[PDB]
Amino acid sequence: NFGIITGVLSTINFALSNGDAYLIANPQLSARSGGRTDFLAGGQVPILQAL
Amino acid sequence: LGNLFKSTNFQSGNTDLVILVTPRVVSAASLENIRQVSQAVEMKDEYRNT
């Protein structure tokens, strides 16, 4: 018995995409000479960490 | 016509925040204390009138 059974398959792609993102952040602070100031505008998320 | 063949997602936002403080050396007769006391009187009167 001598023969062959074979073929090909194919796919077509025409995907096209763009993306833009902009941001400005303008925090401002006041503190006295020799002091320290901390500022946070945002949030807190819970994290499962333990000894 | 391109909008029949194109999909757009758009997001845009803004946040504004200000924090300020005013200190003042006072006593029990000073204007800040009096204003808060009169506020308490008004709150009590409103509760009563309901």
Side-chain angles (χ1 to χ4, degrees):
Chain A
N1 195 195
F2 175 52
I4 190 174
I5 298 177
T6 184
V8 281
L9 299 177
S10 122
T11 317
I12 302 180
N13 297 255
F14 38 82
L16 181 42
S17 145
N18 298 273
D20 320 309
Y22 301 74
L23 85 89
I24 310 174
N26 193 14
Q28 275 155 114
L29 270 194
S30 201
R32 75 179 174 221
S33 170
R36 170 166 169 176
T37 294
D38 303 336
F39 174 49
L40 169 81
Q44 294 183 298
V45 279
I47 303 291
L48 205 61
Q49 81 82 14
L51 169 70
Chain B
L1 261 53
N3 298 267
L4 294 179
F5 310 101
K6 166 176 49 187
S7 197
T8 313
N9 191 86
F10 176 82
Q11 306 176 2
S12 148
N14 173 57
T15 304
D16 285 359
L17 170 70
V18 187
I19 307 178
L20 45 158
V21 296
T22 311
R24 165 86 70 180
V25 173
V26 296
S27 94
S30 291
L31 174 81
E32 291 80 8
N33 199 45
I34 303 299
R35 285 192 311 197
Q36 293 303 112
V37 174
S38 83
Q39 171 74 9
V41 164
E42 261 64 84
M43 282 160 59
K44 180 183 154 182
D45 180 55
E46 184 186 343
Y47 192 6
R48 193 209 290 119
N49 285 338
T50 50

